[PDB]
């Protein structure tokens with residue numbers, strides 16, 4: 001039951017788990033109705049809707065069901081690495097996407113500390 005975010009086909013946050021609140025700093029009510037791009041930094045932020053549009057038309061997976069590390073952005077403006085897995089679903093005839101997130105800040109810190117010593 002980690003950080004899970006569900007968005008519609010236009011990238012608007014539909015569900016936002018409790019763990020996602022603790023990780024991103026946004027309450028579920030504040031997040032719901034916002035675009036998922038509020039969780040990442042630029043350039044990705046301004047680019048995110050184009051990535052979603054691209055996929056929706058080419059039916060071309062780039063990261064759907066792949067799993068990878070990106071940098072996300074918390075409410076206070078701080079950035080952090082996180083592993084992200086996007087899953088695709090359908091409901092009411094329209095696409096929905098789910099993102100499972102695993103915070104990796106601690107890992108990056110440990111790795112960094114071990115490097116500097």
Ligand code: HEM
Nearest residue numbers: 005039040044051052055061062063064070072097098099
């Ligand atoms: C918060 C950190 C995130 C960042 C930095 C990020 C970044 C990106 C990038 C760079 C792409 C396109 C990659 C490519 O075309 O190779 C992309 C695509 C997309 N993202 Fe995100 N994303 C984030 C979170 C999310 C979340 C949480 C969702 C769903 C809950 C989501 C849904 C999508 C979808 C549906 C696409 C298009 C899928 C595809 O191109 O196959 N993203 N994202």
Ligand SMILES: [C-]#N
Nearest residue numbers: 063084085086
């Ligand atoms: C986006 N992944």
